[PDB]
Paper text:
All of the tertiary structures are similar to wt AXCP and only salient points concerning the heme region are discussed here.
Residue numbers in the entry:
A (entry chain A), B (entry chain A): 1 to 126
Amino acid sequence: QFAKPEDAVKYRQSAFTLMASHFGRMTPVVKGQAPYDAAQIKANVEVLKTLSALPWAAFGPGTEGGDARPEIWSDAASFKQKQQAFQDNIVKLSAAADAGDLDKLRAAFGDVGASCKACHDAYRKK
Amino acid sequence: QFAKPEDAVKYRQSAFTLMASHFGRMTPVVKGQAPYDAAQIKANVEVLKTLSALPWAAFGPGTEGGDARPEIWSDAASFKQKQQAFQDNIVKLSAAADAGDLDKLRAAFGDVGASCKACHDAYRKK
Ligand code: HEC
Ligand code: HEC
Ligand SMILES: O=C1O[C@H]([C@@H](O)CO)C(O)=C1O
Ligand SMILES: O=C1O[C@H]([C@@H](O)CO)C(O)=C1O
């Protein structure tokens, strides 16, 4: 769907921007600094769920650029492993949110964040 | 969810960026220049559906900036009318896509795009 590689870069950066907001905004809730409203969180994780599937199609071949490391393309199976694993951690967070269980939510939140960071560590330029 | 107004600006701009991609990428399909796969389009409009609900919460009070005109806030009921109407046109597009009917999809697509443009004309800076 991208006329030029730059358009794929712009897309994925915007998807990540939204993912950061929908993930990060739950930090005060899982810390207890903000109240836990199970329906609120269930709805927010559903948004996060949708957003978190979007970036991957915007790293198609020829779309090198931004802060994406070239290793995303030379090591495609491993990058795919990392995004699928991340999305499996998002499934786990969805299950916690759907269950309305703050303990499971905090554990699953931490797993998701670790997966974000592990991918950056390997595949996002400094 | 925004630490500073700038973060709300960044959010809404990213949401619009994704909406533009998920809307605009259907242009070749509704023109007949690309094949019509009903399941493909149903799925894409579901994404568009989710994205199109996101910007509005990122124009809260104090979040003036970007290419948002100040009229969004001094005329809140009218801006709310415009976003709700836009989202109702998105409902109409979802119904067309769910029905698998390319004629209804093209008509509904055109209504959505007109609603995007009408809001810009009134509320987005040059
Ligand atoms: C690989 C499997 C990743 C996972 C999982 C997550 N992210 Fe990431 N992110 C990745 C890359 C390769 C890039 C650079 C994209 C580019 O072309 O520049 C990014 C970037 C970001 C950004 C910055 C976006 C911007 O405005 O430029 C943010 C804020 C970000 N990523 C956040 C984020 C979060 C919160 C994640 C888990 C919930 C997450 N990412 C996962 C690669 C990968
Ligand atoms: C008001 C009810 C709007 C509707 C409906 C749509 N948009 Fe819009 N858009 C609006 C504003 C006020 C702004 C400026 C936001 C800012 O703070 O700068 C925008 C901006 C955009 C952009 C540019 C985003 C960027 O990267 O800076 C795009 C690409 C865009 N809008 C697209 C778009 C589409 C495709 C819409 C319908 C499917 C649509 N918008 C509706 C206000 C409103
Ligand atoms: O909110 C965020 O979480 C991840 C990472 O910091 C998790 O440790 C990331 O990159 C964000 O923007
Ligand atoms: O794809 C888009 O459609 C609207 C408008 O052009 C519809 O006429 C818009 O602002 C986009 O980026």
